[PDB]
């Protein structure tokens, strides 16, 4: 429509809109950003290098007083879609990422209300480093966190706020290997810094053990059960050495395979 393109031109006019300046009025007031993580799939947990992969929708909401208009003057339009690459954005990133991919994947449009409210919901494939606890494998429960921070503006310029106390599962696809237990979010400050603020989500996940039970534990027990037979084997049959050496071989192989799967680090060794 002619009115819509007139409004889009007027709002983004680079003469009167600089996308590199924070939308703070009254001098040194802060811009409040609401944050909310929605989980779509838990793509994979790779225990070997300690990385969790997720498909999440990162909802961000803030106010930009420079993107206001009067609906009566623009055919009574209440909101418009602006490209998020040409407006000011809070540089909210996954701070504890692995492989160095801080940002979101797509950079969708932003929905702008006439009162200045910005709504942004870009999808992202994230890789986050989380410590793996191997002690109780394959009945282990992991606690992998996602930490979100503005790497440009400190706590004095933008304050992060949680839209909800938990991450959403409204559009989740169940994993099939990992069970979701809890996804609580928390807002953290440093009492000795005063410029630090972040929002962190804990993903408590529980492994479904049937696969590794069937494929690792039962064979291990079967091989271990043969460790004793050598002493009931008569010395005349001439097969004691074959039995005991074969058992030792199988045990060494299973140890090496399990170590490839779930590495024993210093803090804990798998039972």
């Amino acid at each position: 429509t002619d009115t819509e393109e007139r409004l889009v031109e007027h709002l983004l006019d680079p003469s009167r809109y600089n996308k590199l300046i924070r939308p703070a009025t009254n001098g040194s007031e802060l811009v409040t950003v609401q944050l909310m993580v929605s989980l779509a799939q838990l793509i994979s947990v790779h225990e070997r290098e300690q990385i969790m992969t997720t498909n999440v929708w990162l909802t961000q909401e803030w106010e930009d007083y420079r993107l206001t208009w009067k609906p009566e003057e623009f055919d009574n339009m209440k909101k418009v879609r602006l490209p998020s690459k040409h407006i000011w954005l809070p540089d909210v990133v996954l701070y504890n990422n692995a492989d160095g991919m801080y940002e979101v994947s797509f950079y969708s449009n932003a929905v702008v209300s006439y009162d200045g409210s910005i709504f942004w919901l870009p999808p992202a494939i994230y890789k986050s480093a989380c410590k793996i606890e191997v002690k109780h494998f394959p009945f282990d429960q992991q606690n992998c966190t996602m930490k979100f921070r503005s790497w440009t503006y400190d706590r004095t310029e933008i304050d992060l706020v949680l839209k909800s106390e938990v991450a959403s599962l409204d559009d989740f696809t169940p994993s099939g290997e990992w069970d979701i237990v809890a996804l609580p979010g928390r807002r953290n400050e440093n009492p000795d810094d005063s410029t630090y603020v972040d929002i962190t989500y804990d993903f408590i996940i529980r492994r479904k053990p049937l696969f590794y039970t069937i494929n690792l534990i039962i064979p291990c027990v079967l091989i271990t059960s043969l460790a004793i037979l050598v002493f009931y084997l008569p010395s005349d049959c001439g097969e004691k050495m074959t039995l005991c050496i074969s058992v030792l071989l199988a045990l060494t192989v299973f140890l090496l395979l399990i170590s490839k799967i779930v590495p024993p680090t210093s803090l804990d060794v798998p039972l």
Partner: antibody, heavy 118, light 113 residues
């Protein structure tokens, strides 16, 4: 927040009853729903739990196979279907919120009394 | 299922008296993170239960300070400093550490006279 349960029921022995717990004012899919049975005599028994977000469900040994949990995401409602009923099933059933290892079960349903008799 | 036993089955105590309820577990219910997930719920007659204490060292919001808790891996107890009329009811101990989670036996509270 608020958890709303269905009304009282009266079913003949051998039938099956489905009672619903509906929650509002919070992210329904991200909280486990705990089902608790209170026989009129005494005691609180946990039937099991369901996470509406996924399909994950848990049951207590005493109730495995006796009850089945299902959840609807479009409408913030969770259902429990009780199998073949007996006179021993007459009790009051509660639904409650829960997030394991964090803030725990601070909101409960009103209660849904169930009566089994011919 | 971890079994939780409460003693005494009843605890008559007049107003202003010290009340002690003990809940014991068939197994250890300590968790790796450092917290132990034990909770105490009060259900007055004709009402749904209420949360009083979670993570015993802690306490819920909106409850009188008189309530308190303590215990170790397998033994836990709840203490009420000053008893009042509104405090009458039944108390249950709930463990949130080992799946499935189970309630306590229930310890009814009376006021003696």
């Amino acid at each position: 927040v608020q958890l709303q349960q269905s009304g009282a029921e009266v079913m003949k022995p051998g039938a099956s009853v489905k009672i619903s717990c509906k929650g509002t004012g919070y992210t329904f899919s991200s909280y486990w729903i705990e089902w608790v049975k209170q026989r009129p005599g005494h005691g609180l028994e946990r039937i099991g739990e369901i996470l509406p977000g996924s399909g994950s469900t848990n049951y207590n040994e005493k109730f495995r196979g006796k009850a089945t949990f299902t959840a609807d995401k479009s409408s913030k409602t969770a259902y429990m279907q009780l199998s073949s009923l007996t006179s021993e099933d007459s009790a009051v059933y509660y639904c409650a919120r829960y997030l394991p290892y964090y803030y725990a079960m601070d909101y409960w349903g009103q209660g849904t009394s169930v009566t089994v008799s011919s | 299922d971890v079994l939780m036993t409460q003693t005494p089955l009843s605890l008559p105590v007049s107003l202003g008296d010290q009340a002690s309820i003990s809940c014991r577990s068939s197994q250890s219910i300590v968790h790796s993170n450092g917290n132990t997930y034990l909770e105490w719920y009060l259900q007055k007659p004709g009402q749904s239960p209420k949360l009083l204490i979670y993570k015993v060292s802690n306490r819920f919001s909106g409850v009188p300070d008189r309530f308190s808790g303590s215990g170790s891996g397998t033994d836990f107890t709840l203490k009420i400093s000053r008893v009042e009329a509104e405090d009458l009811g039944v108390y249950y101990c709930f463990q949130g550490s080992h799946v499935p989670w189970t309630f306590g036996g229930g310890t009814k509270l009376e006021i003696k006279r």
